[PDB]
Amino acid sequence: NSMIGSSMPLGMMRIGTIIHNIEMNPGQGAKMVRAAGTNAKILKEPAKGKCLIKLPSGDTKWINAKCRATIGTVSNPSHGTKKLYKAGQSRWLGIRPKVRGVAMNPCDHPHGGGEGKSKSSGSRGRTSVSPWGKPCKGGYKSASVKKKKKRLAEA
RNA sequence: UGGAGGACCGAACCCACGUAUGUGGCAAAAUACGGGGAUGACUUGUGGCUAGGGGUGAAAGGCCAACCAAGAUCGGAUAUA
RNA sequence: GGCAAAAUGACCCCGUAACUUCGGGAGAAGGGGUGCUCUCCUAUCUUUUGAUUAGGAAAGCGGCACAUACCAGGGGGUAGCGACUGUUUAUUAAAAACACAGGACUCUGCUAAGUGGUAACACGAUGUAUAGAGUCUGACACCUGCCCGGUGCUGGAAAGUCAAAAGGAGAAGUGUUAUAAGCUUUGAAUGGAAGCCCCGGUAAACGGCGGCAGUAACUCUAACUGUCCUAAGGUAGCGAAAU
């Protein structure tokens, strides 16, 4: 009897199930997967406090057994599918119009300038860069690779 | 039967497209006649916030007290030339 | 440069094309009618008494003229750019500029990434990958070729190469002594993470995408091949174009 909407610690949870609304620290409060209809999935139960979970990001983590979850995927699966159809919809949600790089005068974004469209060089030009010299394509992480690799190689 | 629309025509309203006027003018940016949208990414009143290598920008090097590729005013300072 | 000026305009009726995303084009275009008088019937109307006001029949009646003044769309055919409504250089540029929903890539497992500050801390967000940030393009349809050699971004192997801290052992100054003790100066074999070096990965990352020389019963050109070079040698498509 694993029934939908119910919660419990993972210690009373069986392998292969589907879950959402996990909490990272023991009882802190559900901060893991929460969005409209997105489902994690457990992978095993070694009785060492930890439980290996596969998250929607594809990657996986270990959560203490005394932590909790909610059976079944979150509600409302379509929201990730509904395509808006004008500008007013964004505006209502809260957005404002976002301006690109190659538009701004060079004084304002590293991609500026040009007499007509252009951004960077054929030798010099580094890549496409954020407003603060940080590059955004290629797999860039900016020395948070330290944190990533530490928490990974804890496996 | 219903009454949706970043729907339509058109005053309030805002905005500022063309011509002519004016060019110590009525006015240090207006007027006449025509123009565009006109339930929406709307217009507005009130009061609060962001302050100069900074703000803010549906991005023009635009705007920040009538003159911004770095405000105003004091001071270094009778700067230098 | 038909700029301006002119003209069309209203209501009712007739009828209305290409095209298509089948919602629209569309007030498409193109026409007619519009006054008042009495009568008839119709409705309607309690504002009581039966008539009055409007509509639509049908007969007059006058004017050149009957939305008579004021008010009030010029329309059609076809390219380019942009999908459009929007926004912008207050106070010479409102556009093809910007945005825009739509698309892809990259980053983030939550003390989330990213941002402001020194720093607490705040935003992110009383949000949790169908989420948030950045980047390029810009509805829709058809589609999106080749190159990772360069710049960047990135994974990774042991090798050497390592800066500093760790520092052998020499040498040297001075000390009876002519050079032991001792202090001191310099040293200086090993030490050394990243990175450098190397091998990879990336083009909806920044970027680049060629020459020659012969060759057919008309020349031509070359379907054919020989060729030099690259990392790769411009595919679909388009084309004296905003080029």
CA of A115 to C1' of C141 (A): 33
The first and second tokens of residue A15, run together, are 């392998």
CA distance A16 to A49: 18
Whether the beta carbon of A54 falls within 7 A of nucleic chain C: the reply is: no
Using DSSP, state whether A90 is helix, strand or coil: helix
Nucleotides, chain C, CB distance < 7 Å: 84-85, 97-103, 105-111, 113-116, 127-131, 133-138, 150-156, 201-202, 205-208
- Torsion angle in degrees (nearest 10) through CA of A124, A127, A130, A134: -80
Show me where chain A is broken: residue before each gap, C-N > 2.5 A. Answer: none
Contact between A75 and A38 (Cβ < 8 Å): no
Judge whether residue A84 contacts strand C, using its CB and a 7 Å cut-off: yes
How many other CB atoms are found less than 10 A from the CB of residue A128?
A: 15
Task: Report the SS3 class of residue A9.
Answer: strand
According to the entry, how was the structure determined?
cryo-EM
Resolution attained, angstroms:
3.9
CA/C1' separation A149–C194 (Å): 16
Nearest-angstrom CA–CA distance, A114 and A107:
12
Written as six digits, the tokens of A89 are 């919809």
